[PDB]
Amino acid sequence: IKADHVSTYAAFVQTHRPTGEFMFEFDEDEMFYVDLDKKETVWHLEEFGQAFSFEAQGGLANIAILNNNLNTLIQRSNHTQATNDPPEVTVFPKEPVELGQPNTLICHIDKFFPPVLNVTWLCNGELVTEGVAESLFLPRTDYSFHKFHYLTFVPSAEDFYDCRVEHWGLDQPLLKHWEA
Amino acid sequence: QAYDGKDYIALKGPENYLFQGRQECYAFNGTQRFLERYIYNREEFVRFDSDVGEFRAVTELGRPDEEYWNSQKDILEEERAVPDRMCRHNYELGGPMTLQRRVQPRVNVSPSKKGPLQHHNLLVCHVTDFYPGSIQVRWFLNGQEETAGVVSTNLIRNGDWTFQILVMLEMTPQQGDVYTCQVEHTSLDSPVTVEWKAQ
Ligand SMILES: *[C@@H]1O[C@H](CO[C@@H]2O[C@H](CO)[C@@H](O)[C@H](O)[C@H]2NC(C)=O)[C@@H](O[C@@H]2O[C@H](CO)[C@@H](O)[C@H](O)[C@H]2NC(C)=O)[C@H](O[C@@H]2O[C@H](CO)[C@@H](O)[C@H](O)[C@H]2NC(C)=O)[C@H]1NC(C)=O
Ligand SMILES: *[C@@H]1O[C@H](CO)[C@@H](O[C@@H]2O[C@H](CO)[C@@H](O)[C@H](O)[C@H]2NC(C)=O)[C@H](O)[C@H]1NC(C)=O
Ligand code: NA
């Protein structure tokens, strides 16, 4: 379809956590989503949150419709479960690496289904839980998902990192290695 | 400045099942096209496309919904109105800050450290933190454009409303050779050049 821009609401509901997601993307970047537990609209960029709004309750209403629609299709499909499509994983820095200068490591997890994952960062084989952030489960046009994980870090010659991903399509955890 | 949304239709009657939807607005040359997709797991089974003007089953699972919903005139009228209401409304409220967002690139040039694993001698123009995604990167050697021996990553989405790309020149440097990477992007008034000299 020819388009200068594509503006898309995407939402899903499923049996396992996260059991619902409701978001709006503009040229494939997530602009806002509804936090289903807080019942609030969350804006990705602060200046957008300052200029625009969205009524969270319409998101919540659509999650309730989609849950109705899920119950209907479970019955109509005779409980067809999809195959588990495992992720492709890439790790890369946000900025060119300069030792001793702060940067951000990105773990991009792509082309997977369903949107059920565990991801963690390791540094020198140990868990890292601070300076970490993650995106939503982001929709793809082929109805699989992608996701980003982030780690703020200061590169150093001796350190090594892994992005460690678990998904039902994988026989064992996938460790994607990175070093400066 | 409030975005309009739209209610999906409520269709009529480890273990995981999933249902997802899309409500897509395609803006092009003063026009809007609206698609609403209903998806069970990874199977889109029914869709409304404003260019068709009614529900179409995409798959056999969608057969009953096409038949029913297309004889509901009030629902069809609501779906046919979405391009001029929700799509247009949301497109018009964004302003320049949305439709003309610009974030200037940073440009770094350095030799690849990865020769043993790449098997090629590559000079890397790493262009980071930019938006929108369209960009052009050119290489020059002593002022002459080099069009052979250039390879690039895909345009890489960072997920944070910026992009990066790495554009690599395969080089056979001689002392005195001066390489230039030139970046052209709509956020810049003039192109950005960065020079690297063969040591
Ligand atoms: C982008 O839009 C302009 C829009 O003008 C359109 O005029 C049509 C009336 O016949 C309407 O059907 C359409 O909805 C209307 N919209 C608006 C917002 O005005 C297109 O240019 C117009 O094209 C028609 C041919 O369809 C011509 O008779 C009109 O005089 C012309 N209007 C003006 C002001 O120039 C434009 O169409 C492309 O450009 C020209 C026509 O100028 C032709 O080369 C092409 O046929 C046409 N291309 C295509 C692929 O249809 C639209 N551009 C594009 C890229 O689609
Ligand atoms: C993410 O991790 C959780 C916790 O380890 C996994 O859920 C457990 O899986 C075990 C062992 O297979 C089950 O026997 C437990 O009952 C599960 N616990 C809970 C609370 O569900 C989960 O499988 C992992 N997710 C993925 C995609 O690998
Ligand atoms: Na809110």
Side-chain angles (χ1 to χ4, degrees), chain A, chain B residues 2-199:
Chain A
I1 300 189
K2 269 140 58 231
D4 296 328
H5 303 283
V6 190
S7 290
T8 298
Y9 289 99
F12 72 82
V13 297
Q14 72 184 339
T15 151
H16 275 74
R17 286 185 173 179
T19 64
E21 199 184 87
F22 184 92
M23 56 88 74
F24 180 74
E25 55 169 13
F26 175 82
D27 295 335
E28 303 175 74
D29 288 311
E30 174 261 308
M31 191 183 276
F32 66 78
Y33 64 96
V34 179
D35 178 334
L36 301 179
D37 290 309
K38 278 62 203 157
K39 285 227 171 82
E40 82 173 26
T41 297
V42 177
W43 284 89
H44 194 111
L45 296 178
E46 193 175 16
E47 70 274 22
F48 286 68
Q50 291 272 345
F52 300 110
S53 67
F54 178 75
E55 174 51 55
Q57 303 179 251
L60 278 122
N62 274 317
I63 288 302
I65 297 168
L66 295 185
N67 271 310
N68 172 280
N69 291 350
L70 179 52
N71 285 355
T72 301
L73 272 96
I74 284 175
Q75 292 318 292
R76 208 140 106 198
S77 69
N78 304 323
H79 300 259
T80 292
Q81 179 152 351
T83 59
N84 294 303
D85 296 322
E88 281 171 41
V89 184
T90 60
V91 183
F92 57 93
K94 190 168 156 61
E95 307 170 32
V97 174
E98 315 156 272
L99 302 187
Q101 298 288 349
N103 204 323
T104 303
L105 252 193
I106 309 171
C107 181
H108 183 221
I109 305 119
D110 198 10
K111 305 174 205 279
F112 60 97
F113 185 91
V116 183
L117 271 185
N118 299 323
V119 184
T120 59
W121 290 103
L122 308 175
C123 182
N124 301 327
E126 304 288 0
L127 193 67
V128 178
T129 50
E130 293 288 309
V132 300
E134 68 186 62
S135 72
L136 266 52
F137 288 93
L138 300 176
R140 282 172 56 91
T141 66
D142 65 8
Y143 313 128
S144 62
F145 295 84
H146 69 124
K147 199 175 197 233
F148 296 88
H149 277 258
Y150 306 92
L151 174 63
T152 49
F153 74 117
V154 176
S156 181
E158 67 212 45
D159 299 334
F160 60 88
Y161 290 83
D162 295 289
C163 185
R164 181 186 188 271
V165 184
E166 300 185 345
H167 189 269
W168 299 336
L170 297 162
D171 292 319
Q172 62 276 313
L174 183 41
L175 272 78
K176 188 65 43 156
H177 189 79
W178 190 84
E179 23 183 279
Chain B
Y3 275 82
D4 279 1
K6 175 178 184 304
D7 285 354
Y8 283 105
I9 298 161
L11 301 176
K12 332 238 65 147
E15 187 168 13
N16 201 54
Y17 308 107
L18 185 148
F19 195 95
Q20 55 176 318
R22 305 292 195 271
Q23 295 166 310
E24 304 174 357
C25 293
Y26 298 77
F28 182 61
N29 195 40
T31 73
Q32 295 289 339
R33 175 169 179 194
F34 175 65
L35 267 75
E36 188 170 79
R37 309 181 195 264
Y38 295 79
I39 302 138
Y40 178 63
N41 294 326
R42 293 189 70 185
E43 186 175 334
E44 184 191 17
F45 62 95
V46 70
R47 166 190 307 171
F48 177 90
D49 180 349
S50 70
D51 267 20
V52 168
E54 52 185 38
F55 297 97
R56 287 269 178 285
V58 178
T59 237
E60 182 217 40
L61 256 183
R63 200 141 313 292
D65 314 292
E66 170 169 349
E67 306 335 317
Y68 183 67
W69 291 104
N70 278 348
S71 57
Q72 310 308 111
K73 299 298 130 204
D74 53 313
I75 297 315
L76 285 175
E77 188 189 317
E78 185 197 349
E79 294 275 18
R80 288 167 179 159
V82 170
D84 199 48
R85 304 264 200 286
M86 179 177 77
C87 299
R88 178 171 61 37
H89 175 274
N90 291 343
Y91 192 67
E92 293 178 351
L93 75 77
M97 83 176 265
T98 307
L99 296 184
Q100 299 288 351
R101 184 173 184 266
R102 283 169 169 73
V103 177
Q104 295 183 358
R106 319 303 200 167
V107 183
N108 181 276
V109 173
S110 66
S112 179
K113 295 211 235 285
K114 297 189 67 221
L117 297 159
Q118 286 164 338
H119 311 292
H120 294 254
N121 190 16
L122 299 174
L123 187 60
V124 183
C125 187
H126 194 174
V127 186
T128 56
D129 291 334
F130 60 92
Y131 191 94
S134 182
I135 194 157
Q136 176 89 4
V137 179
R138 293 160 72 203
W139 277 110
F140 299 83
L141 164 59
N142 302 324
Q144 306 309 305
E145 195 164 357
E146 297 294 303
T147 52
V150 176
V151 296
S152 297
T153 62
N154 290 132
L155 176 63
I156 297 162
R157 189 179 292 274
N158 297 318
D160 63 358
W161 284 74
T162 65
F163 293 92
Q164 59 175 286
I165 196 172
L166 294 86
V167 181
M168 302 168 263
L169 177 65
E170 190 160 11
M171 63 168 172
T172 68
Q174 277 188 332
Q175 191 126 239
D177 281 345
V178 178
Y179 294 80
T180 296
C181 177
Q182 181 167 294
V183 177
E184 300 176 9
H185 189 254
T186 186
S187 69
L188 301 167
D189 291 291
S190 298
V192 166
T193 56
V194 176
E195 158 189 299
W196 177 90
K197 190 143 172 205
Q199 184 93 143

